[PDB]
Structure 1
Amino acid sequence: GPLGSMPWFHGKITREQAERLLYPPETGLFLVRESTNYPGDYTLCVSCEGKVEHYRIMYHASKLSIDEEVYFENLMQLVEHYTTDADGLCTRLIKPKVM
């Protein structure tokens, strides 16, 4: 891998690429990509019954957070939390969007 084993993190995907990628509705399919509209942050796209939910990820002080209450040290641990429980997600993570 790039730096371990984080394929779910594309770090370079467009709206058209993210839309088609999440074509088939399957609760648990998530994907992270560099926020286009907001440079410097990330966006998590999940498929909930065919709907694409985008979760803005704020990166400050070398820490990530979406609820502005739970800060992490990296995207790896961040996903682990959202995978074990919703934590504010329409559907807990189940299968990472492998690219």
Structure 2
Amino acid sequence: AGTKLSLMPWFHGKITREQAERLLYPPETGLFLVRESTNYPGDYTLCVSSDGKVEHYRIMYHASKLSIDEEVYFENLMQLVEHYTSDADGLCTRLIKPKVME
């Protein structure tokens, strides 16, 4: 049993920035994961490989709504990933391929 988010192949839970860097190597544009900081529950960073390195997009919450750009907002993290899977909408790349959680 788990939450929907817990079962999402791109969701790695509480891993560090440095551990994400090792998971997203070698670079492959559009390979991605989301990790959570131990600082605070639901403090997420979307980590995506693009143009030979990892880009890190930290989620913010504004009145409980999630964004990574202060332009486009979502109710939850799964909606955010869904959106950027289909088009870049200003990100460095679409989220093309999950780095599958093991």
TM-score bracket for the superposition, by shorter chain length? 0.7 to 0.9
Instruction: Give 1:73 deviation, angstroms.
Output: 1.0
Structure 2 CA distance for aligned equivalents of residues 23 and 71 of structure 1: 29
Instruction: Give 1:38 deviation, angstroms.
Output: 6.9
Structure 2 length normalisation: TM-score?
0.81
Which residues of structure 1 form unaligned runs of 5+? Answer: none
Q: Which runs of 4+ in 1 moved over 3 A?
A: 35-40
Structure 1 CA distance for aligned equivalents of residues 57 and 74 of structure 2: 15
| CA RMSD across the alignment | 2.1
Structure 1 length normalisation: TM-score?
0.83
Partner of 2:20: 18
User: 85-94 or 37-46, which moves further after superposition?
Assistant: 37-46
1:53-89: CA deviations, max 9, x gaps? 0001112433211111211111111111111111221
Instruction: Give 1:24 deviation, angstroms.
Output: 1.2
Structure 2 CA distance for aligned equivalents of residues 77 and 40 of structure 1: 14
Percent of aligned pairs with the same residue? 95
1:35-67: CA deviations, max 9, x gaps? 357765211111113211000111243321111
Instruction: Give 1:98 deviation, angstroms.
Output: 0.9
Structure 1 CA distance for aligned equivalents of residues 41 and 8 of structure 2: 20
Which residues of structure 2 form unaligned runs of 5+? Answer: none
CA contact (8 A) 1:23 1:50 kept: no
Aligned residue for 2:35, secondary structure, equals: strand
Q: 1:87 to 1:36 in 2, by over 3 A?
A: farther
Structure 2 CA distance for aligned equivalents of residues 6 and 59 of structure 1: 21
Q: Tell me how many residue pairs correspond in the alignment.
A: 97
